[PDB]
Write an enzyme that holds these catalytic residues in place. Structure first.
Site, PDB file in Angstrom:
ATOM      1  N   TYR A 154     -15.511   0.500  -8.176  1.00 27.42           N
ATOM      2  CA  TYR A 154     -15.584  -0.397  -9.356  1.00 27.42           C
ATOM      3  C   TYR A 154     -16.135   0.687  -9.927  1.00 27.42           C
ATOM      4  N   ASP A 179     -23.745   8.730 -32.534  1.00 30.33           N
ATOM      5  CA  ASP A 179     -23.483   9.796 -31.530  1.00 30.33           C
ATOM      6  C   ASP A 179     -23.995   8.949 -29.597  1.00 30.33           C
ATOM      7  N   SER A 202      -8.348  -5.171 -22.366  1.00 29.36           N
ATOM      8  CA  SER A 202      -8.748  -6.569 -22.716  1.00 29.36           C
ATOM      9  C   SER A 202      -8.070  -5.730 -23.668  1.00 29.36           C
ATOM     10  N   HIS A 211     -18.234   2.138  -1.507  1.00 31.34           N
ATOM     11  CA  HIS A 211     -17.486   1.285  -2.208  1.00 31.34           C
ATOM     12  C   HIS A 211     -17.633   0.826  -3.387  1.00 31.34           C
ATOM     13  N   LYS A 239     -10.717 -13.113 -14.608  1.00 34.21           N
ATOM     14  CA  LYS A 239     -10.204 -11.899 -15.424  1.00 34.21           C
ATOM     15  C   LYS A 239      -8.731 -11.622 -15.186  1.00 34.21           C
ATOM     16  N   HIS A 289      -7.305  16.747  -2.222  1.00 40.58           N
ATOM     17  CA  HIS A 289      -6.115  15.380  -3.025  1.00 40.58           C
ATOM     18  C   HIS A 289      -6.566  14.250  -2.533  1.00 40.58           C
ATOM     19  N   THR A 340     -12.525 -11.371 -10.588  1.00 42.78           N
ATOM     20  CA  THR A 340     -11.163 -10.879 -10.394  1.00 42.78           C
ATOM     21  C   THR A 340      -9.856 -11.471 -10.866  1.00 42.78           C
ATOM     22  N   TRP A 371     -12.146  13.142   2.397  1.00 42.05           N
ATOM     23  CA  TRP A 371     -12.942  12.952   1.334  1.00 42.05           C
ATOM     24  C   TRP A 371     -14.397  11.999   1.334  1.00 42.05           C
ATOM     25  N   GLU A 375     -17.970   3.501  -5.276  1.00 41.17           N
ATOM     26  CA  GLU A 375     -16.999   4.114  -6.442  1.00 41.17           C
ATOM     27  C   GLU A 375     -16.235   3.654  -7.186  1.00 41.17           C
ATOM     28  N   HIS A 408     -17.142  -3.213   5.252  1.00 41.10           N
ATOM     29  CA  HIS A 408     -15.490  -3.320   5.438  1.00 41.10           C
ATOM     30  C   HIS A 408     -15.153  -1.999   5.738  1.00 41.10           C
ATOM     31  N   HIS A 409     -15.707  -1.526   5.456  1.00 39.01           N
ATOM     32  CA  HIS A 409     -14.884   0.201   5.907  1.00 39.01           C
ATOM     33  C   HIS A 409     -15.494   0.518   6.754  1.00 39.01           C
ATOM     34  N   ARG A 452      -3.537   7.065   9.500  1.00 37.30           N
ATOM     35  CA  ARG A 452      -3.888   8.049   8.300  1.00 37.30           C
ATOM     36  C   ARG A 452      -3.614   9.816   9.230  1.00 37.30           C
ATOM     37  N   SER A 473     -22.982  15.220 -13.273  1.00 39.60           N
ATOM     38  CA  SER A 473     -22.519  15.101 -14.364  1.00 39.60           C
ATOM     39  C   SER A 473     -22.492  13.648 -14.816  1.00 39.60           C
ATOM     40  N   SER A 474     -22.111  13.218 -13.714  1.00 41.38           N
ATOM     41  CA  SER A 474     -21.457  11.142 -13.603  1.00 41.38           C
ATOM     42  C   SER A 474     -22.959  10.613 -14.070  1.00 41.38           C
TER      43      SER A 474
HETATM   44  C1  HEA Z   1      -9.882   0.841  -7.589  1.00 43.58           C
HETATM   45  C2  HEA Z   1      -9.922   1.355  -6.720  1.00 43.58           C
HETATM   46  C3  HEA Z   1      -9.897  -0.230  -5.542  1.00 43.58           C
HETATM   47  C4  HEA Z   1     -10.090  -1.622  -6.427  1.00 43.58           C
HETATM   48  C5  HEA Z   1     -10.430  -1.671  -7.176  1.00 43.58           C
HETATM   49  C6  HEA Z   1     -10.246  -1.872  -4.936  1.00 43.58           C
HETATM   50  C7  HEA Z   1     -10.491  -3.168  -4.563  1.00 43.58           C
HETATM   51  C8  HEA Z   1     -11.093  -4.260  -3.039  1.00 43.58           C
HETATM   52  N1  HEA Z   1     -10.533  -3.414  -1.980  1.00 43.58           N
HETATM   53 FE1  HEA Z   1      -9.965  -1.853  -1.386  1.00 43.58          FE
HETATM   54  N2  HEA Z   1      -9.778   0.678  -1.304  1.00 43.58           N
HETATM   55  C9  HEA Z   1      -9.745   1.095  -2.150  1.00 43.58           C
HETATM   56  C10 HEA Z   1      -9.932   1.215  -3.430  1.00 43.58           C
HETATM   57  C11 HEA Z   1      -9.837   0.301  -3.863  1.00 43.58           C
HETATM   58  N3  HEA Z   1     -10.149  -0.950  -4.009  1.00 43.58           N
HETATM   59  C12 HEA Z   1      -9.720   2.522  -1.264  1.00 43.58           C
HETATM   60  C13 HEA Z   1     -10.159   4.859  -2.329  1.00 43.58           C
HETATM   61  C14 HEA Z   1      -9.753   2.592  -0.371  1.00 43.58           C
HETATM   62  C15 HEA Z   1     -10.148   3.477   1.437  1.00 43.58           C
HETATM   63  C16 HEA Z   1     -11.368   4.553   1.435  1.00 43.58           C
HETATM   64  C17 HEA Z   1     -10.829   4.927   2.274  1.00 43.58           C
HETATM   65  O1  HEA Z   1     -10.848   4.928   3.403  1.00 43.58           O
HETATM   66  O2  HEA Z   1      -9.812   6.012   2.101  1.00 43.58           O
HETATM   67  C18 HEA Z   1      -9.984   1.000   0.452  1.00 43.58           C
HETATM   68  C19 HEA Z   1     -10.136   0.214   1.506  1.00 43.58           C
HETATM   69  C20 HEA Z   1     -10.231  -0.756   1.240  1.00 43.58           C
HETATM   70  C21 HEA Z   1     -10.943  -1.208   2.611  1.00 43.58           C
HETATM   71  C22 HEA Z   1     -10.847  -0.949   4.180  1.00 43.58           C
HETATM   72  C23 HEA Z   1      -9.807  -0.756   4.802  1.00 43.58           C
HETATM   73  C24 HEA Z   1      -9.437   0.150   6.222  1.00 43.58           C
HETATM   74  O3  HEA Z   1      -9.778   1.179   6.044  1.00 43.58           O
HETATM   75  O4  HEA Z   1      -9.189  -0.553   7.255  1.00 43.58           O
HETATM   76  C25 HEA Z   1     -11.087  -2.630   2.308  1.00 43.58           C
HETATM   77  C26 HEA Z   1     -11.578  -3.723   3.431  1.00 43.58           C
HETATM   78  O5  HEA Z   1     -12.082  -5.389   2.549  1.00 43.58           O
HETATM   79  C27 HEA Z   1     -10.961  -3.064   0.718  1.00 43.58           C
HETATM   80  C28 HEA Z   1     -10.560  -4.255   0.170  1.00 43.58           C
HETATM   81  C29 HEA Z   1     -10.465  -4.028  -1.251  1.00 43.58           C
HETATM   82  C30 HEA Z   1     -11.421  -5.391  -1.505  1.00 43.58           C
HETATM   83  C31 HEA Z   1     -11.299  -7.095  -1.196  1.00 43.58           C
HETATM   84  C32 HEA Z   1     -10.658  -5.325  -3.306  1.00 43.58           C
HETATM   85  C33 HEA Z   1     -11.208  -6.826  -4.560  1.00 43.58           C
HETATM   86  O6  HEA Z   1     -11.869  -6.037  -5.057  1.00 43.58           O
HETATM   87  C34 HEA Z   1      -9.707  -7.288  -4.613  1.00 43.58           C
HETATM   88  C35 HEA Z   1      -9.662  -7.692  -5.491  1.00 43.58           C
HETATM   89  C36 HEA Z   1      -8.501  -8.300  -6.443  1.00 43.58           C
HETATM   90  C37 HEA Z   1      -7.472  -9.308  -6.143  1.00 43.58           C
HETATM   91  C38 HEA Z   1      -7.848  -9.962  -4.793  1.00 43.58           C
HETATM   92  C39 HEA Z   1      -6.489  -9.986  -6.735  1.00 43.58           C
HETATM   93  C40 HEA Z   1      -6.660 -10.606  -8.031  1.00 43.58           C
HETATM   94  C41 HEA Z   1      -7.386 -12.077  -8.327  1.00 43.58           C
HETATM   95  C42 HEA Z   1      -6.291 -13.331  -8.301  1.00 43.58           C
HETATM   96  C43 HEA Z   1      -4.813 -13.144  -8.552  1.00 43.58           C
HETATM   97  C44 HEA Z   1      -7.384 -14.189  -7.813  1.00 43.58           C
HETATM   98  C45 HEA Z   1      -6.197 -15.001  -6.368  1.00 43.58           C
HETATM   99  C46 HEA Z   1      -6.450 -14.400  -5.058  1.00 43.58           C
HETATM  100  C47 HEA Z   1      -6.627 -14.394  -4.381  1.00 43.58           C
HETATM  101  C48 HEA Z   1      -7.824 -16.557  -4.125  1.00 43.58           C
HETATM  102  C49 HEA Z   1      -6.779 -13.768  -3.155  1.00 43.58           C
HETATM  103  N4  HEA Z   1     -10.406  -2.443   0.519  1.00 43.58           N
HETATM  104  C1  HEA Z   2      -6.921   8.048  -8.537  1.00 44.52           C
HETATM  105  C2  HEA Z   2      -6.597   8.008  -7.284  1.00 44.52           C
HETATM  106  C3  HEA Z   2      -5.276   8.549  -6.246  1.00 44.52           C
HETATM  107  C4  HEA Z   2      -4.599   8.835  -6.887  1.00 44.52           C
HETATM  108  C5  HEA Z   2      -3.826   7.915  -8.665  1.00 44.52           C
HETATM  109  C6  HEA Z   2      -3.347   9.383  -6.114  1.00 44.52           C
HETATM  110  C7  HEA Z   2      -2.098   9.628  -6.043  1.00 44.52           C
HETATM  111  C8  HEA Z   2      -0.739   9.747  -5.524  1.00 44.52           C
HETATM  112  N1  HEA Z   2      -1.388   9.592  -3.461  1.00 44.52           N
HETATM  113 FE1  HEA Z   2      -3.097   9.702  -2.522  1.00 44.52          FE
HETATM  114  N2  HEA Z   2      -4.662   9.696  -1.799  1.00 44.52           N
HETATM  115  C9  HEA Z   2      -6.073   9.381  -2.092  1.00 44.52           C
HETATM  116  C10 HEA Z   2      -6.286   9.119  -4.110  1.00 44.52           C
HETATM  117  C11 HEA Z   2      -5.125   8.589  -5.199  1.00 44.52           C
HETATM  118  N3  HEA Z   2      -3.823   9.181  -4.302  1.00 44.52           N
HETATM  119  C12 HEA Z   2      -7.249   9.445  -1.672  1.00 44.52           C
HETATM  120  C13 HEA Z   2      -8.684   8.858  -2.019  1.00 44.52           C
HETATM  121  C14 HEA Z   2      -6.611   9.525   0.172  1.00 44.52           C
HETATM  122  C15 HEA Z   2      -7.326   9.528   1.124  1.00 44.52           C
HETATM  123  C16 HEA Z   2      -7.735  11.006   1.496  1.00 44.52           C
HETATM  124  C17 HEA Z   2      -8.217  10.771   2.832  1.00 44.52           C
HETATM  125  O1  HEA Z   2      -7.293  10.174   3.662  1.00 44.52           O
HETATM  126  O2  HEA Z   2      -8.876  11.612   2.672  1.00 44.52           O
HETATM  127  C18 HEA Z   2      -5.295   9.827  -0.828  1.00 44.52           C
HETATM  128  C19 HEA Z   2      -4.350   9.412   0.116  1.00 44.52           C
HETATM  129  C20 HEA Z   2      -3.106  10.038   0.031  1.00 44.52           C
HETATM  130  C21 HEA Z   2      -1.783   9.849   0.941  1.00 44.52           C
HETATM  131  C22 HEA Z   2      -1.968   9.864   2.976  1.00 44.52           C
HETATM  132  C23 HEA Z   2      -2.593  10.998   3.600  1.00 44.52           C
HETATM  133  C24 HEA Z   2      -2.241  10.912   4.143  1.00 44.52           C
HETATM  134  O3  HEA Z   2      -3.148   9.784   5.676  1.00 44.52           O
HETATM  135  O4  HEA Z   2      -2.545  11.955   5.857  1.00 44.52           O
HETATM  136  C25 HEA Z   2      -0.420  10.042   0.547  1.00 44.52           C
HETATM  137  C26 HEA Z   2       0.603  10.097   1.735  1.00 44.52           C
HETATM  138  O5  HEA Z   2       1.581   9.937   1.245  1.00 44.52           O
HETATM  139  C27 HEA Z   2      -0.689   9.598  -0.734  1.00 44.52           C
HETATM  140  C28 HEA Z   2      -0.141  10.334  -1.984  1.00 44.52           C
HETATM  141  C29 HEA Z   2      -0.200   9.974  -2.963  1.00 44.52           C
HETATM  142  C30 HEA Z   2       0.532   9.935  -4.061  1.00 44.52           C
HETATM  143  C31 HEA Z   2       2.373  10.728  -3.569  1.00 44.52           C
HETATM  144  C32 HEA Z   2       0.394  10.119  -5.551  1.00 44.52           C
HETATM  145  C33 HEA Z   2       0.759  10.281  -6.301  1.00 44.52           C
HETATM  146  O6  HEA Z   2       2.044  11.346  -6.311  1.00 44.52           O
HETATM  147  C34 HEA Z   2       1.384   8.937  -6.778  1.00 44.52           C
HETATM  148  C35 HEA Z   2       2.050   8.896  -8.395  1.00 44.52           C
HETATM  149  C36 HEA Z   2       0.641   8.743  -9.620  1.00 44.52           C
HETATM  150  C37 HEA Z   2       1.339  10.074 -11.058  1.00 44.52           C
HETATM  151  C38 HEA Z   2       2.243  10.863 -10.512  1.00 44.52           C
HETATM  152  C39 HEA Z   2       0.460  10.340 -11.932  1.00 44.52           C
HETATM  153  C40 HEA Z   2      -0.701  10.334 -11.363  1.00 44.52           C
HETATM  154  C41 HEA Z   2      -2.056  10.523 -13.095  1.00 44.52           C
HETATM  155  C42 HEA Z   2      -2.875  10.640 -12.836  1.00 44.52           C
HETATM  156  C43 HEA Z   2      -3.846  11.088 -11.669  1.00 44.52           C
HETATM  157  C44 HEA Z   2      -4.005  10.422 -13.760  1.00 44.52           C
HETATM  158  C45 HEA Z   2      -4.480  11.810 -14.384  1.00 44.52           C
HETATM  159  C46 HEA Z   2      -5.107  12.406 -16.040  1.00 44.52           C
HETATM  160  C47 HEA Z   2      -4.437  12.425 -17.030  1.00 44.52           C
HETATM  161  C48 HEA Z   2      -3.368  11.513 -17.865  1.00 44.52           C
HETATM  162  C49 HEA Z   2      -5.448  11.775 -18.129  1.00 44.52           C
HETATM  163  N4  HEA Z   2      -2.220  10.299  -0.464  1.00 44.52           N
HETATM  164 CU   LIG Z   3     -14.712  -1.117   0.335  1.00 48.89          CU
HETATM  165  O   LIG Z   4     -13.824   0.218  -1.938  1.00 48.95           O
END
Ligand code: HEA
Ligand code: HEA
Ligand SMILES: [Cu+2]
Ligand SMILES: [O-]
Ligand SMILES: CCCCCCCCCCO[C@@H]1O[C@H](CO)[C@@H](O[C@H]2O[C@H](CO)[C@@H](O)[C@H](O)[C@H]2O)[C@H](O)[C@H]1O
Ligand SMILES: CCCCCCCCCCO[C@@H]1O[C@H](CO)[C@@H](O[C@H]2O[C@H](CO)[C@@H](O)[C@H](O)[C@H]2O)[C@H](O)[C@H]1O
Ligand SMILES: CCCCCCCCCCO[C@@H]1O[C@H](CO)[C@@H](O[C@H]2O[C@H](CO)[C@@H](O)[C@H](O)[C@H]2O)[C@H](O)[C@H]1O
Ligand SMILES: CCCCCCCCCCO[C@@H]1O[C@H](CO)[C@@H](O[C@H]2O[C@H](CO)[C@@H](O)[C@H](O)[C@H]2O)[C@H](O)[C@H]1O
Ligand SMILES: CCCCCCCCCCO[C@@H]1O[C@H](CO)[C@@H](O[C@H]2O[C@H](CO)[C@@H](O)[C@H](O)[C@H]2O)[C@H](O)[C@H]1O
Ligand SMILES: CCCCCCCCCCCCC
Ligand SMILES: CCCCCCCCCCCCC
Ligand SMILES: CCCCCCCCCCCCC
Ligand SMILES: CCCCCCCCCCCCC
Ligand SMILES: CCCCCCCCCCCCC
Ligand SMILES: CCCCCCCCCCCCC
Ligand SMILES: [Ca+2]
Ligand SMILES: [Cu+2]
Ligand SMILES: [Cu+2]
Ligand SMILES: [Mg+2]
Lengths: 535, 256
Positions: free
Chosen positions: A272, A116, A283, A268, A346, A86, A343, A156, A270, A317-318, A465, A184-185
């Protein structure tokens, strides 16, 4: 016919990425349905070792019907494989291909008035590497893997020594999949950067470029730094497994934690790379349906640049519970917090764009407004997690799962849907039916919130998890979460139905610009669809 | 002994605190939650108001502004101040957590696929700890009549399935316990939510954590780094008992 795949035109490549990303997305979503079938109730009822002694086909069909616990030997390996699949599919083979490979390739050249991409043949190869990567990922699920079964159950992010000691070659196939994705990327990023810098139309100055084109540009730079680092990390896993090295094995003076630093250096950035193009789409959409120019164009660009740069200095932070010194922990916590500022600029600018506008609540706008609310919920939870002292409790619990699904599945994905509804008329020459677009939005909105909001509660209560089964006390919120996932799935099947209907018999698009004058970029200046050769 | 450190049905909050560190987590998270609930309520109300006020039926001609310097300054500085505030309360908590004090009791913990090994270097005690219902206790990781009986015999009930182990780490109340954590094969993670502690068990590295339990009882954790097929099935039981009951347990392990 079949030359759809040998095409070098940015519009055709873009369409192929979108469709493919959509299909892989369906596959990865189907995995989560099965996941949530098993999590719906405590005790293992679906993932039974007994199903292993059947055919591949028969075993599959048996595993979809619940067994009594007394007839179901828990198979943890299958849970771990499903979860890993997944995650890999989503992070490498769905969402970036859709946003960057899809909308990026289609619209960036249009937005800058380029005819192009700089290297169209390279662009076509980008796509085939993505398909090859996907095929390898999928094949890994059917290859000899861990515990004398098929598939890799390693998460993953492939942490060693677990990933390096997993039996079979499934894990090797996964590593090769990821290499192909990175390739590819990188090719895509080369094309985006060269095209952006060299092939703008006369008059199209740096500070006249649409925000979506900027989002793709910045994203492309992040890919160039992040993806090579990942290629290193996973090659070292490959050599530890197959060629006698000892990078991550303590018996040879290696250190598993070293892999984590390298992996998260990519890991990380990834996220962004995922969300920036979605910022770009939001936008364009909000400006269009607010009928009002985007507030603070320049701060919007510089906020994206800042997010991108800051995204490279926060990786640990991970790793708060992995043995980081108090100094490292304190630094990464403070560095991470800074990201909230650009953020926040924006989000407020998007609201300021709506302020004083003339708001039309068409489907694309619904996705954009959902994005603002839902991405905020996720972002703010990310700030909680940046506090190492609280992350002590939340790390590797469902609170983290809730965070990342709010930003990805209710954030980036809402950006994908905004883009689809915004641009489907432009790309196909057919319009989606409005009532169906809104119904899709509301079903997804209700369903995805029901799926993920309760995972905050599960995490607070200490649910880890990557668990196939859980203590009875976690039952209630797991049940609610599963019902939410089933509704979300119904919404996605309905969406596919809406796309099928649209492309097959949707209202004929007649206008160059079928929205309004405040959709003011070059694509809206061209026919729908655009000519094979534009500009 | 009272079962305190465990999830409760329908729970939405933290597990009960049984240490000063866990107490600090609850407070800090509580403080930040109030803040982030305010941010998001604020953001959400602004959206809904703008959609209501500036809907195309109610505001027929859109404005064209793209700047507002006072507001733009305000919406940069206020987030900066909010965050510095959180930092100011959060960094002390962090320092308290990670500065390891002098130990009254030392336990060395080793993660294995799929069980925990405990050693008390001052006491020359060691033993292994397996989930009740694991293959080690005759099971295959699922509930059964036999598993329920074993849970009963160990002083638990069927409700503690997946949490209770055959042997527990026992410690005295109101003493400083330092736990040294490592992994034998793959990375595991040792944790007890009620204590506010979690530390990865990494092969080749010995890392430390501390807690001081403030009341007697039973407290559970579960392995918190995916470590293979039985990751879900290698939990942690800590029994916090009186100073006298702790000595009694120690003497029970003494070989004459
Ligand atoms: C689109 C993907 C995406 C994005 C954009 C972000 C954005 C951010 N992530 Fe997240 N994150 C993931 C996807 C993402 N993350 C994934 C996949 C993992 C798990 C990896 C794994 O273990 O599998 C993870 C895990 C993860 C962790 C580790 C947790 C753990 O494993 O214990 C942390 C820790 O700091 C973190 C922090 C943040 C922060 C601070 C932001 C910031 O960018 C957020 C900034 C936005 C806001 C804060 C809201 C808008 C702001 C305002 C309205 C201003 C006012 C707000 C304040 C003054 C607070 N993320
Ligand atoms: C893009 C990132 C993404 C998305 C969309 C989702 C979607 C969902 N994920 Fe995902 N999830 C991850 C990224 C994502 N997940 C990752 C990285 C992990 C960690 C794996 C690991 O532990 O190693 C995780 C782990 C994870 C867990 C925890 C597993 C565990 O710890 O044992 C669970 C549990 O319920 C879960 C559930 C779901 C569900 C119910 C949905 C969806 O069913 C929610 C409903 C959303 C939709 C129905 C629409 C989705 C649309 C798209 C994806 C766009 C397709 C493209 C086009 C249309 C062009 N996910
Ligand atoms: Cu991070
Ligand atoms: O992250
Ligand atoms: C889950 C995934 C969701 C993805 C949603 C996005 C879908 C966009 C697909 C649009 O595909 C377009 O289809 C047109 C047909 O409608 C093609 O024109 C083709 O057909 C025309 C006739 O209709 C001819 O005039 C043209 O020459 C010929 O290129 C056009 O090139 C092609 O890009
Ligand atoms: C596997 C997933 C399962 C999900 C199933 C989803 C079920 C869909 C409900 C079908 O009912 C539809 O409701 C529409 C909205 O009321 C009607 O549009 C009608 O009403 C609209 C008014 O809002 C108009 O725009 C349309 O032209 C007009 O056809 C449409 O005819 C009708 O069939
Ligand atoms: C798992 C698979 C799920 C499948 C779900 C597929 C959802 C797509 C449904 C499309 O609905 C169509 O919407 C049109 C646009 O609203 C309607 O046109 C209706 O309304 C038009 C606009 O008023 C009229 O001109 C038409 O004649 C009148 O038929 C049409 O009837 C209705 O069928
Ligand atoms: C932190 C939370 C984020 C909240 C987001 C909501 C933002 C809403 C505040 C915007 O305020 C408007 O800004 C305009 C631009 O500054 C002002 O126009 C003023 O300035 C314009 C610029 O030339 C003139 O055209 C106008 O006549 C003059 O009223 C207008 O009065 C004021 O109400
Ligand atoms: O326990 C902690 O002991 C620290 C003393 O080691 C203090 O840290 C404080 O004092 C340090 C002086 O070395 C600073 O570096 C820290 O940032 C600051 O939080 C902190 O108050 C206190 O709770
Ligand atoms: C005890 C009988 C209950 C019936 C359970 C039906 C489960 C159907 C699941 C199939 C859906 C595939 C995704
Ligand atoms: C144009 C009137 C239709 C009714 C629209 C319902 C309100 C939509 C609120 C948008 C907020 C989405 C999070
Ligand atoms: C007790 C609050 C329930 C929250 C429901 C999730 C949406
Ligand atoms: C105690 C047995 C509970 C199993 C019920 C099966 C419900 C499965 C529904 C799946 C929905 C898929 C869309
Ligand atoms: C603003 C989004 C934050 C989501 C966290 C929800 C946690 C709520 C639980 C409250 C229980 C307190 C004891
Ligand atoms: C002393 C606490 C410092 C808090 C760091 C937050 C700064 C980010 C802007
Ligand atoms: Ca189950
Ligand atoms: Cu383990
Ligand atoms: Cu584990
Ligand atoms: Mg971990």
């Amino acid at each position: 016919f079949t030359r759809w795949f040998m095409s070098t035109n940015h519009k055709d490549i873009g369409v192929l990425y979108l469709f493919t990303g959509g299909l892989v997305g369906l596959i990865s979503v189907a995995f989560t349905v099965y996941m949530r079938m098993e999590l719906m109730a405590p005790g293992v009822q679906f993932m039974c070792a007994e199903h292993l002694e059947s055919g591949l086909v028969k075993g599959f069909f048996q595993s979809l019907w619940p067994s009594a616990v007394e007839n179901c030997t828990p198979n943890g390996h299958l849970w771990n494989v499903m979860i890993t699949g997944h995650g890999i599919l989503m992070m490498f083979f769905v969402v970036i291909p859709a946003l960057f490979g899809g909308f990026g390739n289609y619209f960036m050249p249009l937005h800058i008035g380029a005819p192009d991409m700089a290297f169209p043949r390279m662009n076509n190869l980008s796509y085939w590497l993505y398909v090859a990567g996907t095929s390898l990922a999928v094949a890994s699920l059917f290859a000899p893997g861990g515990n004398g079964q098929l598939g890799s159950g390693i998460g993953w992010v492939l942490y060693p020594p677990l990933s390096t000691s997993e039996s079979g070659y499934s894990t090797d196939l996964a590593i090769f999949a990821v290499h192909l994705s990175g390739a590819s990327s990188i090719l895509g990023a080369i094309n985006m950067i060269t095209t952006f810098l060299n092939m703008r139309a006369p008059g199209m100055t740096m500070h006249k470029v649409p925000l979506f084109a900027w989002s793709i540009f910045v994203t492309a730079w992040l890919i160039l730094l992040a993806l090579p680092v990942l290629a290193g990390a996973i090659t070292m896993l490959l050599t530890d497994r197959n060629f006698g090295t000892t990078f991550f094995q303590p018996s040879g003076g290696g250190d598993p934690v070293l892999y984590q630093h390298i992996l998260w250096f990519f890991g990380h950035p990834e996220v962004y790379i995922i969300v920036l193009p979605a910022f770009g789409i939001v936008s364009h959409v909000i400006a269009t349906f607010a009928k009002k120019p985007i507030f603070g164009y320049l701060p919007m660009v510089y906020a994206m640049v800042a997010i991108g740069v800051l995204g490279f200095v926060v990786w640990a932070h991970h790793m708060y519970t992995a043995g980081l010194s108090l100094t490292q922990q304190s630094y990464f916590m403070m560095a991470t917090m800074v990201i909230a500022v650009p953020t926040g600029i924006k989000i407020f600018s998007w609201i300021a764009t709506m302020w004083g506008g003339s708001i039309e609540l068409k489907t694309p706008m619904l996705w954009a407004l959902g994005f603002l609310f839902l991405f905020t919920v996720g972002g703010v939870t990310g700030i909680v997690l940046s506090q190492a002292s609280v992350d002590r409790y939340y790390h590797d619990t469902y609170y983290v799962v809730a965070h990342f699904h709010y930003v990805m599945s209710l954030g980036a994905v809402f950006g994908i849907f905004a883009g689809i509804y915004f641009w489907i008329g432009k790309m196909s020459g057919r319009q989606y039916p409005e009532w169906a677009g809104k119904l899709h939005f509301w079903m997804m909105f209700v369903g995805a919130n029901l799926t993920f909001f309760p995972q905050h509660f599960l995490g607070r209560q200490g649910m880890p998890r990557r668990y196939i089964d859980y203590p009875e006390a976690f039952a209630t919120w797991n049940f609610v979460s599963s019902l939410g996932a089933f509704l979300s799935f119904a919404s996605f099947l309905f969406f596919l139905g809406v796309i099928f209907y649209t492309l097959t018999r949707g209202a004929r698009v007649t206008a160059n610009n079928y929205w309004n004058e405040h959709a003011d970029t070059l694509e809206w200046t061209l026919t729908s669809p655009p000519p094979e050769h534009t500009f | 002994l009272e079962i305190i450190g465990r999830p409760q049905p329908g729970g939405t909050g933290f597990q009960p605190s049984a240490s000063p560190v866990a107490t600090q987590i609850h407070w800090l998270d509580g403080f930040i939650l109030v803040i982030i609930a305010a941010i998001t309520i604020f953001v959400t109300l602004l959206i809904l108001y703008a959609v209501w006020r500036f809907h195309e039926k109610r505001n027929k001609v859109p404005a064209r502004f793209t700047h507002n310097s006072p507001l733009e300054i305000a919406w940069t500085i206020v987030p900066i101040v909010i965050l510095v505030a959180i930092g100011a309360f959060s960094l002390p908590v962090l320092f308290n957590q990670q500065e390891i004090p002098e130990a009254d009791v030392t336990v060395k913990v080793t993660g294995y696929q799929w069980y925990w090994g405990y050693e008390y270097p001052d006491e020359e005690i060691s033993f292994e700890s397996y989930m009740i219902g694991s293959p080690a206790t005759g099971g295959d990781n699922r509930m059964s009549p036999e598993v329920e009986q074993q849970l009963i015999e160990a002083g638990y009930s069927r409700d503690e399935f997946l949490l209770a182990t055959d042997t527990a780490m026992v410690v005295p109340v109101n003493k400083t316990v330092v736990v040294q954590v490592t992994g034998a094969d793959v990375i595991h993670s040792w944790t007890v939510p009620a204590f506010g502690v979690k530390q990865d068990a990494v092969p080749g590295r010995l890392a430390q954590l501390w807690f001081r339990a403030e009341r007697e009882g039973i407290f559970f954790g579960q392995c918190s780094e995916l470590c293979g097929i039985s990751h879900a099935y290698m939990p942690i039981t800590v029994k916090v008992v009186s100073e006298e009951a702790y000595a009694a347990w120690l003497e029970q392990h003494h070989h004459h």
